[PDB]
């Protein structure tokens, strides 16, 4: 699933990046430590407006 990064992740991402990643990675990993958030039109409006 694709997700943005909030944090660099080493070894799979950078703040910033929009990327895919492994499902299972991003539930019990990214989501879960607030690293990164789903990258649906919703969520990039909202992080645009609080960058
Ligand atoms: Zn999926
Ligand atoms: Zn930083
Ligand atoms: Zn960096
Ligand atoms: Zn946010």
Not at 22 to 30: I, T
Request: glycine share 10%.
């Amino acid at each position: 699933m694709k997700v943005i990064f909030l944090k660099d992740v080493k070894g799979k991402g950078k703040k910033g990046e929009i990327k895919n990643v492994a499902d299972g990675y991003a539930n019990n990993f990214l989501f879960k430590q607030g690293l990164a958030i789903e990258a649906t039109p919703a969520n990039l409006k909202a992080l645009e407006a609080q960058k």
